């Protein structure tokens, strides 16, 4: 048994931050 | 390499050797950087991983473009965009005549544009020196050598003091105080800006305690108001002598009223009150800025 | 755009690394979270999906090479990260460490040298299952 | 009076424990000095002279049982001191730890159950050779 | 044991069983404490090592004397000086008539004498309750059960909050604040002192949050002047209600003016401003102190 | 080679502190 999010979309997987 | 015809050797250091080369995709003149792989570990240096990992994600017109990465058992090549010469070689060539003020202004504006891109995308260059800034024949300067550069985005990360040359080293690092950021790079460009105008280094030190004394010779010894936590530091001693802060008119004679205002804010003692790359671009000094071609004659 | 869809089976296989008694002992060892904190553990998962590690490639040695890479990239103190060597190379690490670094470069090659892991990405991978104990591993003094 | 004359050869034999690569790796591991600080290392020497350990009895296992006793006596956090088990009992410590505790009680019996080591005594044993690196192992957060 | 003839069983707990026994050195009546050795580890408990290691070095007339330590493969015996009964059994026996004031004064003075010896020789009892304080037929009280006791001499050592029963637990531990010392034991004896006079527990709580409320019911909710760091705590919440601090005349009706002054200083909120065992002995309350025999009739 | 104090007399080897 495992309780983790079934499908997750990451908008920023590769790259640097923004500020 | 193979597909690169080595023309001539340019740079050299602890990092490795830099060459001039062509290609198989026309006479694409490039800068081929050969990395000196460790003798015992025979692993890629931390400086190389940081440089390649950052430049693989930094695409700005004022940042040196990384083209290819050749990695083999005992080799590590870095293909870069070829740029005629570095700032140091241009400052040495224009040491008697001098770099014209619109061209000094252009270069500072361009370097600030690139550094603002780094700081906004949370990246510290940590090694801003004239040898590490590349120019071309059409009047464009770029931030080069991201060897000592790191991403400052992730919190609670550890930071080292052995980062930049004494001459351009921030006083918050010279006084061994932890928690440094964007402001360190500003101090280095402020020293570079002054160097372009006076044709000589701002604080040419011989040691760490001598570098601090060269700063307090011009900007004066700091008080607990200009720099709130000047005395409360890890590498502080009460034996430090107090000195007078000479006016910027004397410090930089060819620079105008606006140029003196920008230089002072860049060389501010408090890192939390020192000008940011974003705020410095907005300064009234860059109101009459143009992009001129640099001097090159036979 | 730099997008990637993370599935349940990707995070389930990654959390199975912490089922090994050697790994759990290693996390226990690191009390001050100097070498294996939530951000460095967020980074090790990111490197796995980047290298496109298969189910059979989800081993303890692969976890340490990816964590060492994360410490090479984000941690300026070079001395601290050497504690990884005896946990993956046994009690003969003093001469077994260069072959580990060769694998670290091999993984760095496998991820197209894109070893920079942003805070935004780390917080995004953490949020998939924030209830997990490895994300409860916070730091205070750098 | 509770007096004891400590000779050069007593401190020389004790510092030879730190010549072993396993011991030096163990001290390296403990960065925050939670289990093996200057005071706990001052305590481990005190226990050796108390038990009246001979040259042949100056082994790595004897160093860990004395350090565990020092952590049992002076440290309220019981969880932290369990990190000693894998360094003296190998990678099968999960069932090898009760036999270590039997030796710890055996040493406690050998010292006439006088396991209280005062600050005055610790500072006195430290001062014999304060230049030594094990006394440069200070703590800040309890 | 062997050389000890077990007369009768007295105490029992998680620690083990306490018996009454004789000897081979005449009819030396003693208190033989058998320790419950762990089921899996089969090692001596941390509480036993701390108790034996401290008592092997504590020789004061108001501290229970340890005579012998029998240790075998599966056993751990502790030979102690026999003392007729504990304070709790005496307070229960004198619950309707009441303990006389000179006798209350005598016991408090004797307990303070022993605790001052502990704190001067840098030892925390950390478990001061009436069951853990032993009396004899000739009017002498002693500090017993050093199970939770530790030496606080060595600096930067770690400290636990699970130390004493709620009823006698210090508020600096009830509010989970680290850095506690000598003052914790003072709070427990102050609660014991009041209990002897009013014939009932001072703050009889049912939980941790209920214990704090019982303290603020009598002594009132603390302000940032009585306790400077009351709000700035690890286990603090603004939802805590403010209450009035009733006068000590109401709190303890049979105690005199001097007795009220000593009780208040012992139950002070700030641990850095709470009375020490040394200062409390000097109080004008112990000016007319005598050593009387306790009540025992058939 | 070793540079440690040849003879050291400890006034308080066994016992508790005093303050
Ligand atoms: Zn720590
Ligand atoms: Zn630490």
Please characterize this protein's 3D structure.
The PDB classes it as cell cycle. Keywords: Telomere, Meiosis, Kinase, cell cycle. The assembly is hexameric. Crystal structure of SUN1-Speedy A-CDK2. Chains A, F: SUN domain-containing protein 1. The organism of A, F is Homo sapiens. The complex is a heterohexamer, with two copies of chain A (19 residues), two copies of chain B (298 residues) and two copies of chain C (142 residues). Chain A is mainly β. Helix content of chain A is 0%, strand content 21%. Chain A is built from no helices and one strand. Chain A has one strand at residues 7-10. In chain A, 16% of the residues are buried. Chain B has two domains: 6-81, Phosphorylase Kinase, domain 1 (2-Layer Sandwich); 85-286, Transferase(Phosphotransferase) domain 1 (Transferase(Phosphotransferase), domain 1), CATH 1.10.510. In chain B, the strands form three sheets. Chain B has a five-stranded antiparallel sheet, with helices on one face. A three-stranded antiparallel sheet of chain B has the order 6-8-9. In chain B, strands 7-10 form a two-stranded antiparallel ribbon. In chain B, helix 3 (101-120) packs antiparallel against helix 5. The longest helix of chain B has 20 residues, at 101-120. Chain C has 142 residues and is mainly alpha-helical. Chain C has one domain (1-142). Chain C has helices at 8-15, 21-29, 38-51, 60-74, 85-88, 93-110, 119-126, and one strand at 4-7. In chain C, helix 3 packs across helix 4. The longest helix of chain C is centred in the last third of the chain and has 18 residues, at 93-110. Chain C starts with a strand and ends in a 16-residue tail after the last helix. Classes of the chains: A mainly beta (19), B alpha+beta (298), C mainly alpha (142). Chains in contact: A-B, A-C, B-C, C-D, D-E, D-F, E-F. At the D-F interface, strand 1, helix 1, helix 3 and helix 7 of D face strand 1 of F. Strand 1 (7-10) of chain A pairs antiparallel with strand 1 (4-7) of chain C.
Topology:
The complex is a heterohexamer, with two copies of chain A (19 residues), two copies of chain B (298 residues) and two copies of chain C (142 residues).
Chain A: E1 7-10
Chain B: E1 6-12, E2 16-21, E3 30-35, H1 46-55, E4 66-71, E5 76-81, E6 85-86, H2 87-93, H3 101-120, E7 123-124, E8 133-135, E9 141-143, E10 150-151, H4 171-174, H5 183-198, H6 208-218, H7 248-251, H8 257-266, H9 277-281
Chain C: E1 4-7, H1 8-15, H2 21-29, H3 38-51, H4 60-74, H5 85-88, H6 93-110, H7 119-126
Helix pairs in contact in C: 3-4, 3-7, 4-6
Bound molecules: zinc ion (2 copies).
One zinc ion binds at residues 31-32 of chain D.
């Amino acid at each position: 048994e495992s309780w983790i999010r079934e499908q997750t979309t990451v908008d920023h997987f590769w790259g640097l931050d923004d500020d | 390499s193979e597909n690169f015809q080595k023309v001539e050797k340019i740079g050299e250091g602890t990092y490795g050797v830099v060459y001039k080369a062509r290609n198989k995709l026309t006479g694409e003149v490039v800068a081929l950087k050969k990395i000196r792989l460790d003798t015992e570990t025979e692993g890629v240096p931390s400086t190389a991983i940081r440089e390649i990992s950052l430049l693989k994600e930094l695409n700005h017109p004022n940042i040196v473009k990384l083209l290819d990465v050749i990695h083999t058992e005992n080799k590590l090549y870095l293909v870069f965009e070829f740029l005629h010469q570095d700032l140091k070689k241009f400052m040495d060539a224009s040491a008697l005549t001098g770099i014209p003020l619109p061209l000094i202004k252009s270069y500072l504006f361009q370097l600030l544009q690139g550094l603002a891109f780094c700081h906004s995308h949370r990246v510290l260059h940590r090694d801003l020196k004239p040898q590490n800034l590349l120019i071309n024949t059409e009047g464009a300067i770029k931030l080069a050598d991201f060897g000592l550069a790191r991403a400052f985005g992730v919190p609670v990360r550890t930071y080292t003091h052995e980062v930049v040359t004494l001459w351009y080293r921030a006083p918050e690092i010279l006084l061994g105080c932890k928690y440094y950021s964007t402001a360190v790079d500003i101090w280095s460009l402020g020293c570079i800006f002054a160097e372009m105008v006076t044709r000589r280094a701002l604080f040419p030190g011989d040691s760490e305690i001598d570098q601090l004394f060269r700063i307090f010779r011009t900007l004066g010894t700091p008080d607990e108001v200009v720099w709130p936590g000047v005395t409360s530091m890890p590498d502080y001693k009460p034996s430090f002598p107090k000195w007078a802060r000479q006016d910027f008119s004397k410090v930089v004679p060819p620079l105008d009223e606006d140029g003196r205002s920008l230089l002072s804010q860049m060389l501010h003692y408090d890192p939390n009150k020192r000008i940011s790359a974003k705020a410095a671009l907005a300064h009234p000094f860059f109101q009459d800025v143009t992009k001129p071609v640099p001097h090159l004659r036979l | 755009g730099p997008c990637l869809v993370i599935q349940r089976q990707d995070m389930t296989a990654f959390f199975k690394l912490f089922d090994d008694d050697l790994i759990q002992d290693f996390l226990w060892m690191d009390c001050c979270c100097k070498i294996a904190d939530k951000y460095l553990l967020a980074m090790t998962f990111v490197y796995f999906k980047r290298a496109k590690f298969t189910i059979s490639e989800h081993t303890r040695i692969n976890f340490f090479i990816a964590l060492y890479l994360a410490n090479t990239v984000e941690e300026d103190e070079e001395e601290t990260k050497y504690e990884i060597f005896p946990w993956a190379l046994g009690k003969n690490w003093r001469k077994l460490f260069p072959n580990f670094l060769k694998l670290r470069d091999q993984l760095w090659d496998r991820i197209d040298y894109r070893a920079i892991v942003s805070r935004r990405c780390c917080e995004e991978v953490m949020a998939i299952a924030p209830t997990h104990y490895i994300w409860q591993r916070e730091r205070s003094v750098h």
